[PDB]
Curated annotation (Swiss-Prot), chain B:
Consequence when changing residue 23 to I: In strain: Omicron/XBB.1.5, Omicron/EG.5.1
Protein function: Attaches the virion to the cell membrane by interacting with host receptor, initiating the infection. The major receptor is host ACE2. When S2/S2' has been cleaved, binding to the receptor triggers direct fusion at the cell membrane. When S2/S2' has not been cleaved, binding to the receptor results in internalization of the virus by endocytosis using host TFRC and GRM2 and leading to fusion of the virion membrane with the host endosomal membrane. Alternatively, may use NRP1/NRP2 and integrin as entry receptors.
Gene behind this protein: S
Subunit structure: Binds to host ACE2. RBD also interacts with the N-linked glycan on 'Asn-90' of ACE2. Cleavage of S generates a polybasic C-terminal sequence on S1 that binds to host Neuropilin-1 (NRP1) and Neuropilin-2 (NRP2) receptors. Interacts with host integrin alpha-5/beta-1 (ITGA5:ITGB1) and with ACE2 in complex with integrin alpha-5/beta-1 (ITGA5:ITGB1). May interact via cytoplasmic c-terminus with M protein. May interact (via N-terminus) with host bilirubin and biliverdin, thereby preventing antibody binding to the SARS-CoV-2 spike NTD via an allosteric mechanism.
Effect of residue 1 to K: In strain: Mu/B.1.621
Effect on the protein upon substituting residue 31 to A: In strain: Omicron/BA.2, Omicron/BA.2.12.1, Omicron/BA.4, Omicron/BA.5, Omicron/BQ.1.1, Omicron/XBB.1.5, Omicron/EG.5.1
Annotated organism of origin: Severe acute respiratory syndrome coronavirus 2 (2019-nCoV)
The protein's name in its UniProt record: Spike protein S1
C-alpha cells in the first residue's frame, strides 16, 4: 500500500470523476452558448431587460 | 462641418466622465438606434472606451 497508490487509485479515480463533472460545469459557464457574453451580468448591464 | 461617409472621422475620448442621460432627455435626434448597448443602460453603465 505504501509503495503503490494504484490499489487506492480506483477510489481516487471515482473522486476525480466527481471533480471533473464539477469542473465541466465551470467550463460551461465560460462557454457563450450563442450569447454575446458568457457572463449573465455583462449582458444585463449592456442590454435592456 | 464634418468629413464625408467614406472619410469617416473617429475620435478617442478618455479620462472624462460620460453621461448619455442629457442627450436622451433632449431627444433632438429624430431616431435613436442601439444594438450592442442601449440608452437607459448607458447612464448606469460605465464605458472604458468612448
Amino acid at each position: 500500500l505504501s509503495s503503490t497508490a494504484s490499489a487506492l487509485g480506483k477510489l481516487q479515480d471515482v473522486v476525480n470523476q466527481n471533480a471533473q463533472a464539477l469542473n465541466t460545469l465551470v467550463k460551461q459557464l465560460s462557454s457563450n452558448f450563442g450569447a454575446i457574453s458568457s457572463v449573465l451580468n455583462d449582458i444585463l448591464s449592456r442590454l435592456d431587460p | 462641418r464634418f468629413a464625408s461617409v467614406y472619410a469617416w472621422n473617429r475620435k478617442r475620448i478618455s479620462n472624462c466622465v460620460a453621461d448619455y442621460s442629457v442627450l436622451y432627455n433632449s431627444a433632438s435626434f429624430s431616431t435613436f438606434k442601439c444594438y450592442g448597448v442601449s440608452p437607459t443602460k448607458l447612464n448606469d453603465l460605465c464605458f472604458t472606451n468612448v
